Design a protein around this nucleic acid. Structure first.
Ligand SMILES: [Mg+2]
Ligand SMILES: [Mg+2]
Ligand SMILES: [Mg+2]
Ligand SMILES: [Mg+2]
Ligand SMILES: [Mg+2]
Ligand SMILES: [Mg+2]
Ligand SMILES: [Mg+2]
Ligand SMILES: [Mg+2]
Ligand SMILES: [Mg+2]
Ligand SMILES: [Mg+2]
Ligand SMILES: [Mg+2]
Ligand SMILES: [Mg+2]
Ligand SMILES: [Mg+2]
Ligand SMILES: [Mg+2]
Ligand SMILES: [Mg+2]
Ligand SMILES: [Mg+2]
Ligand SMILES: [Mg+2]
Ligand SMILES: [Mg+2]
Ligand SMILES: [Mg+2]
Ligand SMILES: [Mg+2]
Ligand SMILES: [Mg+2]
Ligand SMILES: [Mg+2]
Ligand SMILES: [Mg+2]
Ligand SMILES: [Mg+2]
Lengths: 271, 88, 117, 70, 104, 66
RNA sequence: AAGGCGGCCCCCUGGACGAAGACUGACGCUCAGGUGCGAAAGCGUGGGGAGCAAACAGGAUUAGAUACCCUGGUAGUCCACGCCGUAAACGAUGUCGACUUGGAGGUUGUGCCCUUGAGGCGUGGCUUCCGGAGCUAACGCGUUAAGUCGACCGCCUGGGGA
């Protein structure tokens, strides 16, 4: 539920919270946690590779089942939890044999529901079965690209992928970007949309809410010197040049894909 | 509307003769049953304004029947709203 | 030249022009002629004479394919709605079928607005 | 209007039957009706004037059947 | 309970599996304490127009007095089975039992 | 001279195809009640049954589509 | 109830009418303020977007043509949730009840006669047209009144300005 905050102060004037009362108000499941050390956007050479990253709140990593290999064994959904590592909420499920795991929470999933992986699984939101067993035209998420590798597509808070076709070993997908992509028909997929669809409805309100998320401020390029950026310089506000990267690459429109290995898997590009 | 068995179960519950079917408490409890049954309908279907007009018709009719019962005999009015759980 | 025995005459009779297309029973087109291509323009090409010479040209253009039997699909309202199949008989073709295949939606897409003339 | 020419049938016969069946199924007036959009005001107005034309002409024909002219 | 008239149209190459579907559906209803009133296989029949790029289908009529929940489950069974092409359930005022004009 | 008024049926059956074929034209259009003299109650039942037989491919929607 | 509602199927659901009875026993009518619904266009957020199409562009027409005509075409039209709260939102006729000559239909029930056919005789609801008395400035309305009466409400007071 989105809640507009009352303007008792600037910085609360424009804040929209996303309040979910179903999330667990306690500590997460400790065995499935591990350390997630921050980087600062710096590689093994110590240099900043990706900019604007730094700071933020400490985050523990939640081990999430994307491979979804417990076939045949049904599982009940114990509780829903918050994951700082990702936009979607996670679900703590309990298998019959006594194993607990974290999955991505689908849209309509709640505490007490039954999920089941495997080929003979039913078709309800939460089940994971190969797309040669999934009917054409359904919305799935957590989609594998390779069989047994683990789900890589449609993992963010409100996403889903439509299955538009199937030709033998392959199925054709309608990705969230609008791209039509071929995937082998033996790759697993999980039914339904991903949960937290109103994640994009939040408004941070203030700069600190981005510094909480580890997003350092972005200096725009024309506010620099010509040694710093191609856009820099000028006596006043001058920009008499085409918009490029900090490294002199055109940004407004120029394509950058140069992978001829996967061009056979792309049916149509996005528009 | 309300089903036939639930109607006859109310009629036999609050009717002096199990066939009066038009007494003031019978018409009130039949309205209160259909109202409380349609709380779930309009909680799910909030845009069913055409059915909601029939619901408000039931409420206004129950209120007129209650006000008649109040000035005709108060003790039946108290026993009625106490048994049906009516705030007024 | 490949001989073919049976054929289909598609007739696209609009208000402004009539298009005659001889094809096989598979839709692989054999030859075509239009009323505008029959030496007529503007007011002359929305006439039934323009269509019966577009049909005479199209039969001359499918002369070498050796067609003797022909069925006719007719689409659209126009003046060459009938005089075309008149000349297509008069070429010396035994007519077989005259089917009307004008597209009629079941209240589908919205037509354009009315001409305030 | 899929019309097969019967064996040893003239073409003007089969053509007149095809115009007959196309006028029966009502195609030309359908396309002329669907060439432009007609508002539901204009459609309700044309249907009301068609019914009033049907009706005042039925009463005028039956009343005019009675009285003479010379 | 609620009298339904169910007619479904099976892919004709799966005509052999038809009595297995009928026996499962009948055992679904009577397992759900439902009655079955009429049950008429109509065989292969030429379609009026080609569904799914094919011209014939296998028809089954069934008149049923079942609760609506298992009928909604049966609709989902028709929905996810690709052998059945079309399914139509029409609610009826009463239970009909007389034979169809095309079973004759 | 309504036939359904004569025979006295409570509801027109969509399965009676030879009847519904006596009430549709060659191009699959529903024949109007002006011609057959059908009472408009049975005309509504007939159109509601023809639209179902069209859904079940027992009757065509038109003569052309294939 | 009005706005309005048009393939088919299911689920939930409101209202009307009829037939015999049974029951309560005036419990009714209207309604300022109030509350609710309320076409299209429009606004906000999030989607969607085939066709149509304000704006706009080009072509013509013309004395000119920021238009009609043509070729394109964006918001919009569609969906969800909110807001707006207006129309020649019209029957230009407020709601409820009673009485007052007729005719031809349409629709929807229902009763009776041997249904001796889809008929014959009735009795209810809704609805269309004509028209009598009466009314009205006239046009016309005319048992669904703009006739004869009763209850309550809303409104008008020369044209502009507004
Ligand atoms: Mg950055
Ligand atoms: Mg920025
Ligand atoms: Mg900046
Ligand atoms: Mg500087
Ligand atoms: Mg430089
Ligand atoms: Mg300067
Ligand atoms: Mg400059
Ligand atoms: Mg009631
Ligand atoms: Mg045009
Ligand atoms: Mg008494
Ligand atoms: Mg008021
Ligand atoms: Mg609108
Ligand atoms: Mg909008
Ligand atoms: Mg939008
Ligand atoms: Mg578009
Ligand atoms: Mg235009
Ligand atoms: Mg006003
Ligand atoms: Mg009006
Ligand atoms: Mg007014
Ligand atoms: Mg009132
Ligand atoms: Mg009159
Ligand atoms: Mg007066
Ligand atoms: Mg009056
Ligand atoms: Mg007056």
């Amino acid at each position: 539920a989105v809640v507009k905050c009352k303007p008792t102060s600037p910085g609360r004037r424009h804040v929209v919270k996303v309040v979910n009362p179903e999330l667990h108000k306690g500590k997460p499941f400790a065995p499935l946690l591990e350390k997630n050390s921050k980087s600062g956007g710096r590689n093994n050479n110590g240099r900043i590779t990706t900019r604007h990253i730094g700071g933020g709140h400490k985050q523990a990593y939640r081990i999430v089942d994307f491979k979804r290999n417990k076939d045949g064994i049904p599982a009940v959904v114990e509780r829903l939890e918050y994951d700082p590592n990702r936009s979607a909420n996670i679900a703590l499920v309990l298998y019959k044999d006594g194993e607990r795991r974290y999955i991505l929470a689908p849209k309509g999933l709640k505490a007490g529901d039954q999920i089941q992986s495997g080929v003979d699984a039913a078709i309800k939101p939460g089940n994971t079965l190969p797309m040669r067993n999934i009917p054409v035209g359904s919305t799935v998420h957590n989609v594998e690209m390779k069989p047994g590798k683990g789900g890589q597509l449609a993992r963010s808070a409100g996403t889903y992928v439509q299955i538009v076709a199937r030709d033998g070993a392959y199925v054709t997908l309608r990705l969230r970007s609008g791209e039509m992509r071929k995937v082998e028909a033996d790759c697993r997929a999980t039914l339904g949309e991903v949960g937290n669809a109103e994640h994009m409805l939040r408004v941070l309100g203030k700069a600190g809410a981005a510094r909480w998320r580890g997003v350092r401020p972005t200096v725009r390029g024309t506010a620099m010197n010509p040694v710093d950026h191609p856009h820099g310089g000028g006596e006043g506000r001058n920009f008499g040049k085409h918009p490029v990267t900090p490294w002199g690459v055109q940004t407004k429109g120029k394509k950058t894909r140069s992978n001829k290995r996967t061009d056979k898997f792309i049916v149509r590009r996005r528009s | 509307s309300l089903s036939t068995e639930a109607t006859a179960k109310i009629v036999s519950e609050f009717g002096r003769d199990a066939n009066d079917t038009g007494s003031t408490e019978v018409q009130v409890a039949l309205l209160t049953a259909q109202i409380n049954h349609l709380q779930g309908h309009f909680a799910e279907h909030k845009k069913d304004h055409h059915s909601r007009r029939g619901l408000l018709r039931m409420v206004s009719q129950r209120r007129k029947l209650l006000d008649y019962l109040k000035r005709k005999d108060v003790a039946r009015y108290t026993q009625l709203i106490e048994r049906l759980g009516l705030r007024r | 030249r490949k001989q073919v025995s049976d054929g289909v005459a598609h007739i696209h009779a609009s208000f402004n022009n009539t298009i005659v297309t001889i094809t096989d029973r598979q839709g692989n087109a054999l030859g075509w002629a239009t009323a505008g291509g029959s030496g007529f323009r503007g007011s002359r090409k929305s006439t039934p004479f323009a269509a019966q010479v577009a049909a005479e040209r199209c039969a001359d253009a499918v002369k070498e394919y050796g067609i003797k039997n022909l069925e006719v699909m007719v689409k659209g309202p126009g003046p060459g709605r009938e005089s075309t199949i008149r000349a297509l008989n008069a070429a010396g073709f035994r007519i077989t079928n005259i089917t009307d295949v004008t597209p009629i939606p079941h209240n589908g897409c919205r037509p354009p607005k009315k001409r305030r003339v | 209007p899929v019309i097969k020419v019967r064996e040893n049938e003239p073409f003007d016969v089969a053509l007149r039957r095809f115009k007959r069946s196309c006028e029966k199924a009502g195609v030309l007036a359908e396309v002329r009706r669907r060439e432009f959009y007609e508002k539901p005001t204009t459609e309700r107005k044309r249907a009301k004037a068609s019914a009033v034309k049907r009706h005042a002409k039925k009463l005028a024909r039956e009343n005019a059947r009675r009285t003479r002219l010379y | 309970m609620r009298h339904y008239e169910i007619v479904f149209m099976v892919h004709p190459d799966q005509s052999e599996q038809v009595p297995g579907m009928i026996e499962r559906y009948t055992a679904a209803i009577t397992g759900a304490e439902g009655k079955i009133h009429r049950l008429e296989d109509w065989g292969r029949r030429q379609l009026a127009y080609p569904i799914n790029k094919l011209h014939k289908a296998h028809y089954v009529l069934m008149n049923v007095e079942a609760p609506q929940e298992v009928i909604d489950e049966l609709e989902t069974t028709f929905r996810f089975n690709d052998a059945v092409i079309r399914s139509m359930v029409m609610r009826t005022k009463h239970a009909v039992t007389e034979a169809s004009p095309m079973v004759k | 001279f309504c036939r359904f008024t004569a025979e006295g049926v409570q509801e027109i059956d969509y399965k009676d195809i030879a009847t519904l074929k006596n009430y549709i034209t060659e191009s699959g259009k529903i024949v109007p009640s002006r011609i057959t003299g059908t009472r408009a109650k049975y005309q509504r039942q007939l159109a509601r049954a023809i639209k179902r037989a069209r859904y079940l491919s027992l009757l065509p929607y038109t003569d052309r589509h294939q």
